[PDB]
Amino acid sequence: SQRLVFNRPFLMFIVDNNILFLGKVNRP
Amino acid sequence: RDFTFDLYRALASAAPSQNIFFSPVSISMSLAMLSLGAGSSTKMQILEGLGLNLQKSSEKELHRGFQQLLQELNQPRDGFQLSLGNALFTDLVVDLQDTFVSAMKTLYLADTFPTNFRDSAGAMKQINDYVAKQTKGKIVDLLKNLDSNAVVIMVNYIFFKAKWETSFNHKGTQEQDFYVTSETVVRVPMMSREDQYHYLLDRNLSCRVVGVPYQGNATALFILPSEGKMQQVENGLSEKTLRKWLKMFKKRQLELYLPKFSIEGSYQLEKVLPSLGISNVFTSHADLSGISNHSNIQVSEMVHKAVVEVDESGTRAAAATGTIFTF
DSSP: OEEEEOOSOEEEEEESSSEEEEEEESOO | OOHHHHHHHHHHHHSTTSOEEEOHHHHHHHHHHHHHTOOHHHHHHHHHHTTOOSOHHHHHHHHHHHHHHHHHTTSOOSSSEEEEEEEEEEOTTOOBOHHHHHHHHHHHOOEEEEOOTTSHHHHHHHHHHHHHHHTTTSSOOOOOSOOSOEEEEEEEEEEEEEEBSSOOOGGGOEEEEEESSSSOEEEEEEEEEEEEEEEEEETTTTEEEEEEEBSSSOEEEEEEEOTTOHHHHHHHOOHHHHHHHHHHOEEEEEEEEEEOEEEEEEEEGGGTGGGGTOOGGGSTTOOOTTTBOSTTOEEEEEEEEEEEEEOSSEEEEEEEEEEEEEO
């Protein structure tokens, strides 16, 4: 298994045949 | 013109290194409703800002599409929760056009409530309580220090709650360093789960894309730009890019580490939308003859508030957009 860590700013999309929410987690 | 992503970029540019979070559908739906009572250049800017061409058929399809979406959501979701709604709060002094009210009720299933805007405190309580109720307590105090010259406030709300198809094990969550920058580090609870995931290495924009499914048809997409490439990824965001990611996804085994987090976004869209060419509606030259024949009617502001909570069990997200009209 490939190790993938989200420990840098990342984007998040919540989708369902439409883009319900969109954002950037810069400072959790 | 790409509404969702041109808006994203405007927000990102207005607040560098800050969290960004909003609901594209909440805002687009609000702008679509606003166009119902707009005319001439004011309406043109709104439709073009949404990404439509000059074809009348495109305008009809815009509303038909949203009406279909709202009607579809009247059916119980399968595996999760998704609510989307609209409401008009109007003062008794205000005289709305018959056609606008009818279109709002028929196309957008809008609720219509009388409001005494002279009582600013009471108006805020009425509307904020409504928004809080519709968002199950997630969007509180949407309106703050209300103008008092307000005559109509159009509200759109959206509420989403879903469990991950496969939850993260709480025993797999440990504190780890999160690098806001190479020099700015913050401690965060890092969740983890080894499993098969839809994955793509985008060498064009230089980012890794991972899809994490919710119970039901919805899914979350997390994008991790390569070191130093966040700006590059942001510049490349588009409807086409999203379509590409979703269709090119391949299954791969990953030991995924994702932070447990909660972020939010609070915006005064009237200061941002002009960046997308939508400006007249916020001026004294606004053509809102479709909503009221009363003189000097314009949108003073369009406030948006959105919040999201991501944890081991799933995600809760909500947002509301309040479009305020004044005389």
